């Protein structure tokens, strides 16, 4: 029986491994809840120059 022991260390250190952050589609010109890299908000996204 091939066996692997994974030991995770969550201590006082800058975290290096994390679960992937999945996303959804991006919709503009509409009032929407947005979350960009942890920045949360509610508003209308429009093309900015």
């Amino acid at each position: 029986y091939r066996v692997v022991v994974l030991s995770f260390e969550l201590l006082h250190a800058p975290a290096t491994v994390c679960g992937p952050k999945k996303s959804t589609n991006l919709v503009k010109n509409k009032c929407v809840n947005f979350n960009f890299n942890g920045l949360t908000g509610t508003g209308v996204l429009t093309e900015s120059n």
Binding site: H12, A13, P14
Partner: protein
């Protein structure tokens, strides 16, 4: 080299240096919450021995998740001459 708990490879920080074509490379190093932050900016300099007069902002460059205490630092140099045979002069680089 033990507990090698971090390795990073990327494009050169210091570009090619290949007569008075001096270059100013300014860097800022910080150690905050285990994150090692390096900021830098580069500009060709013209016949100014010391720091010049002007304003140039350093753009963020790299944030390393190294997370280990730091107290001291030292710069790394290049031996163009030979250690066993130190010549009288001109073996180095323009004194």
């Amino acid at each position: 080299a033990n507990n090698c708990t971090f390795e990073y490879v990327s494009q050169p920080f210091l570009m090619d240096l290949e007569g008075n074509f001096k270059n100013l490379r300014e860097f800022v190093f910080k150690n905050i919450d285990g994150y090692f932050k390096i900021y830098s900016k580069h500009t060709p300099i013209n016949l100014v021995r010391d720091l010049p007069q002007g304003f140039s902002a350093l753009e963020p460059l790299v944030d390393l998740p190294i997370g280990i205490n730091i107290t001291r630092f030292q710069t790394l140099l290049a031996l163009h001459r030979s250690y066993l045979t130190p010549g009288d002069s001109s073996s180095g680089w323009t004194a």
